[PDB]
């Protein structure tokens, strides 16, 4: 997912700009957009939610708009359990759990019913769980006390000021996610929120991992309340961002430190080439109209060939075989950018599979690792230009294997395909520095791959006076067998052709398509 | 200082669908509006919706085998349906009642439109506030921050 927020001053008009982007799954029940646009005499909110939530989570109206991304919030404990005498060792002492006989009925292949026993044990921690390698497993999960989450967003979105989305935000019941705001009033902000336990030692690793469950010492009662977790608003450099990294760098400059807070609130890891790219993108560019920010929503640079090709090529080019010399070239040759015509593209997909595992994570073949102090140009360079080679001789095997040459054009094994609509596709992978993000499929026997994960509710907003908005929905607004609603944008994605956004009701009225009026009584 | 533009005051119940199937939800008051929105993602996406509130009240294996059973087993362990019935009964009386409005719109699209409801989905009907609530609680508290792979030592692929 990404996320920006551009303080008036960073832009041409004097407006506040935002990116509403979030990255997940196309094909999963619960992780599907939908795109809405509710109107009463006290309130508008125009956006797109989960299917089944009945607020808006990605919202924005003519005043304000918020937008999210997946933080990893440690909400939640695992416990592994010393099983002794039929309960559990803790403080020294053996403890009984709590048990209920609770049942549930399973659906038979007859159509009938049987009746299954389900035991239910907890231990002072929460309920447990035996994994199948037998390991006895608590677990505990903050905020089970707050019923509040679907009346909290409502009334962060339907805010009429700063101050309410802010009071609102501060009842911490929405356990989760980065939230970025900006609003026409000029103000915009980032929040690392959620709800997270106080515990008196321990990073986050450790708190991660399986905490042990035999003492009092690790037993967390208590959250923190929002001031104590990562936010930052109107910050001198104008903007925010998040893409899924770490909250230390937010903007730039940065407005605080890791050391600032707990260290098991979130990690100090390496930030992830397209975080890196979300960062320049924003920093780099002043005076940004609403068509610029749209056009740097696009970028798709192979960050990652930036910080290895200039290694890998001249030690590649040294090579008795013709074919790694040729691969070398044509990776030279290329601009470096994830287009439908890229020649050179899967090739180095495949090389960076290797070079830094199969998620593009891996960090352990540069020569200079990811700091701190350069964190947006770092880790760089190759450690082992000769190991590198290696690994191109293996991906020149893999590209042909999967895709039938060394050079196929990027777009034609790259498609986005719904129903019977079949476009090129463009931009890729968000850990090679694609900043627009389609994690595309392991290939078919075709050598023809498709997102699995994505860019799937893209809107960007400008709350000028009327607001300016413009989306898209990957996948459409639909999913039930037959409608036309599914594959109806993919097209207009695939030319980045975004749709005008329609808040107005006189805009409202000159689109319509259909009227259902409807009548509710309690 | 300079204002919004006017806000538009609904004087009628109705949704104003365009060309790509974007609902244009306008009601007289909010659990008008909510009514609506349940109404259009009942329409746009009722199977799954159904599916997932079936989940939610921990009888996915009791609709549909032992591909939900896993689920099942998450959930009543965790206490999710029971705690969602609670989540429901403390909701302020003004947002409880948005919630019964948004499960009211699902059920009334599903009845002035049953041909368009998959089968085996047709068995959770009717669906509740608490329902909503549930699904958001399994959603928030039990994929995004305690997903079962963490506790039960999994997790999905790439």
């Known amino acids: 997912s990404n996320s920006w927020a551009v303080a008036p ?38 956006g797109a939610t989960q299917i089944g939530l009945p607020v808006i989570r990605f919202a924005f109206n003519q005043r304000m708009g918020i937008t999210n991304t997946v933080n990893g919030m440690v909400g939640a404990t695992n416990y592994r359990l010393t099983l002794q005498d039929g309960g559990y060792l803790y403080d020294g002492q053996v403890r009984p759990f709590e048990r209920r006989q609770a049942s549930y009925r399973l659906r038979q292949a007859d159509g009938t019913t049987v009746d299954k026993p389900l035991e239910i044990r907890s231990s002072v921690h929460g309920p447990v769980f035996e994994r199948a390698d037998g390991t006895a497993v608590a677990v505990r999960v903050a905020g089970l006390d707050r ?71 690790y037993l967390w009662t208590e959250t923190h309340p929002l001031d104590d977790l990562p936010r930052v608003t109107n910050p001198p450099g104008g903007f925010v961002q998040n893409s899924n990294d770490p909250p230390w760098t937010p903007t730039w400059p940065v407005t605080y430190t890791p050391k600032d807070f707990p260290s098991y609130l979130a990690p100090q890891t390496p930030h992830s080439l397209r975080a890196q790219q979300s960062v320049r993108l924003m920093s780099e560019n002043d005076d940004l109209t609403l068509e610029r920010f749209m056009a740097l929503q696009l970028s798709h640079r192979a960050v990652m060939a930036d910080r290895t090709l200039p290694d890998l090529i001249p030690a590649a080019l040294i090579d008795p075989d013709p074919e790694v010399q040729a691969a070398a070239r044509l990776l030279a040759a290329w601009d470096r950018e994830f287009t439908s015509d890229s020649r050179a593209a899967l090739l180095f997909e495949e090389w960076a599979r290797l070079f830094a595992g199969q998620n593009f994570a891996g960090q ?114 639909s999913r039930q067998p037959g409608t036309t609603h599914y594959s109806d944008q993919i097209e207009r994605v695939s030319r980045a052709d975004f749709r005008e956004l329609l808040l107005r009701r006189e805009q409202v009225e000159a689109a319509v398509q259909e009227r259902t009026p409807f009548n509710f009584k309690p | ?139 928030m508290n039990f994929l995004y921050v305690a997903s079962p792979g963490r506790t039960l030592g999994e997790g999905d692929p790439p």
């Open chain 1, 9 to 46: 001053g960073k832009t041409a008009n004097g407006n506040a700009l935002l990116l509403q982007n979030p990255h997940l799954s196309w094909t999963t029940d619960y992780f599907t957009y939908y795109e809405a646009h509710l109107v009463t005499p006290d309130f508008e909110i125009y």
């Open chain 1, 147 to 217: 019923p509040g989450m679907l009346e909290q967003y409502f009334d962060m979105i339907t805010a009429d000021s700063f101050d309410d989305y802010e009071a609102a935000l501060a009842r911490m019941q929405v356990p989760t996610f980065n939230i970025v705001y900006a609003d026409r009033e000029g103000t915009i902000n980032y929040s690392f929120n959620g709800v997270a336990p106080k515990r008196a030692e321990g990073d986050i690793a450790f708190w991660q991992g399986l905490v042990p469950g035999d003492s009092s010492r």
């Open chain 1, 364 to 477: 352990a073949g540069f020569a200079t690792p990811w700091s701190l102090d350069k964190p947006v140009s770092t880790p760089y360079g190759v450690r082992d230009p000769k190991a590198a080679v290696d690994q191109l001789r293996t991906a020149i095997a893999n590209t042909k294997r999967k895709y039938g040459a060394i050079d196929r054009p990027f777009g034609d094994a790259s498609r986005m395909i719904l129903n019977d609509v079949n476009v090129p596709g463009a931009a890729g992978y968000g850990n090679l520095g694609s900043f627009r993000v389609f994690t595309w499929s392991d290939p078919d026997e075709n050598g023809v791959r498709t997102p699995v994960h994505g860019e799937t509710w893209v809107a960007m907003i400008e709350f000028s006076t009327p607001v300016r908005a413009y989306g898209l929905m990957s996948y459409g607004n």
């Open chain 2, 1 to 139: 200082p300079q204002a919004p533009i006017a806000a538009y005051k609904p004087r009628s119940n109705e949704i104003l669908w365009d060309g790509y199937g974007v609902p244009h939800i306008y009601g007289v008051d909010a659990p008008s509006a909510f009514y609506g929105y349940g109404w259009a993602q009942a329409r746009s996406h009722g199977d799954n919706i159904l599916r997932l509130y079936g989940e939610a009240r921990g009888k996915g294996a009791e609709y549909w085998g032992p591909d939900y059973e896993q689920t099942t087993v998450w959930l009543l362990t965790n206490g999710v349906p029971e705690r969602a019935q609670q989540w429901y009964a403390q909701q302020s009386p003004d947002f409880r009642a948005n919630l019964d409005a948004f499960a009211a719109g699902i059920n009334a699209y599903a009845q002035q439109n049953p041909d368009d409801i998959s089968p085996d989905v047709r068995q959770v009907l009717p669906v509740s506030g608490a329902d909503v609530v549930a699904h958001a609680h399994r959603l």
